[PDB]
Amino acid sequence: MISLIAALAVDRVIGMENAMPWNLPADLAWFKRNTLDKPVIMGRHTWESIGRPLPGRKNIILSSQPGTDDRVTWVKSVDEAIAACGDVPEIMVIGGGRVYEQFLPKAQKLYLTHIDAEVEGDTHFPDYEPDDWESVFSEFHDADAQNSHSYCFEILERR
Ligand SMILES: NC(=O)C1=CN([C@@H]2O[C@H](COP(=O)(O)OP(=O)(O)OC[C@H]3O[C@@H](n4cnc5c(N)ncnc54)[C@H](OP(=O)(O)O)[C@@H]3O)[C@@H](O)[C@H]2O)C=CC1
Ligand SMILES: C[C@H]1CCc2c(N)nc(N)nc2C1
Numbered sequence: 001m002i003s004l005i006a007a008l009a010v011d012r013v014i015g016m017e018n019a020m021p022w023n024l025p026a027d028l029a030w031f032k033r034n035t036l037d038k039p040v041i042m043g044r045h046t047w048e049s050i051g052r053p054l055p056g057r058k059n060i061i062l063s064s065q066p067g068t069d070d071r072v073t074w075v076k077s078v079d080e081a082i083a084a085c086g087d088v089p090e091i092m093v094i095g096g097g098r099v100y101e102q103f104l105p106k107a108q109k110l111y112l113t114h115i116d117a118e119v120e121g122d123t124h125f126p127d128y129e130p131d132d133w134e135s136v137f138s139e140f141h142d143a144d145a146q147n148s149h150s151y152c153f154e155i156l157e158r159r
C-alpha cells in the first residue's frame with residue numbers, strides 16, 4: 001500500500017521557497033505518528049528542505065543524479081523508490097509537489113492536514129479528483145497558543 005501525507009494551506013499550497021511557512025507543532029506530531037517505522041519517499045528538494053534524515057524511518061530520496069549522502073537511500077525512478085522500500089505494509093510519500101503528482105495515481109490513502117492559512121506559494125499538492133476519494137477520518141482543531149491556525153486532520157481512502 002502506497003500513501004501520500006501532506007499539509008495543505010489554502011488553494012492546495014504546500015510550500016514557498018523550499019519552506020512550509022506555518023508553525024504547527026500539532027501537524028509535526030501527526031506527521032511523526034503516521035510515518036514512524038514506515039519507509040518514507042521524498043524528492044530531492046524536500047530532502048534539502050528537511051535538511052537531515054528523519055529518524056526511525058527508512059529514508060528514500062528520488063533524484064535523476066547520484067546520491068550525496070549515504071545516511072539515506074537514493075533512487076532514480078518511482079518504481080525503483082517503491083522497490084527500495086521492500087515488502088512493507090505501507091509506504092509513506094512525504095513530498096514535494098512533483099513527487100506527489102507521480103505517486104498520486106498509485107496511492108490508496110491520503111493523510112491530509114487542511115490548514116486554514118493564506119500562503120503565497122510556489123508548490124501545490126495535486127488537484128485530486130474528489131469523487132475518487134472517501135473521507136474515513138476527520139478531526140478539526142481550533143488554533144491555540146502553540147498552533148497559529150485552525151487545521152483539520154483528514155484521512156481519505158481511494159474508492
Ligand atoms: N506541506 C507539505 O506537506 C510539504 C511541502 N513540501 C514542500 O514542497 C516543496 C518541494 O517540492 P518540489 O519543488 O515539487 O520538489 P520535490 O521535493 O518533489 O523534489 C523534486 C526532485 O525530486 C527528484 N525526482 C522527482 N521525481 C523523480 C523521478 N521520477 N525520478 C528521478 N528523480 C525524481 C528530482 O531531482 P533531480 O533534480 O536531482 O533529478 C526533482 O528535481 C518545498 O517547498 C517543500 O517545503 C514538501 C514536503 C511536504
Ligand atoms: C516536517 C514536515 C515533513 C513533511 C510533512 C508531510 N509530508 N506531511 C505533513 N503533514 N507534515 C510534514 C512536516
Ligand SMILES: [Ca+2]
Pocket residue numbers: 080083
Ligand atoms: Ca527492482
Ligand SMILES: [Ca+2]
Pocket residue numbers: 116117118148149150
Ligand atoms: Ca489562519
Ligand SMILES: [Cl-]
Pocket residue numbers: 028031032054
Ligand atoms: Cl518527524
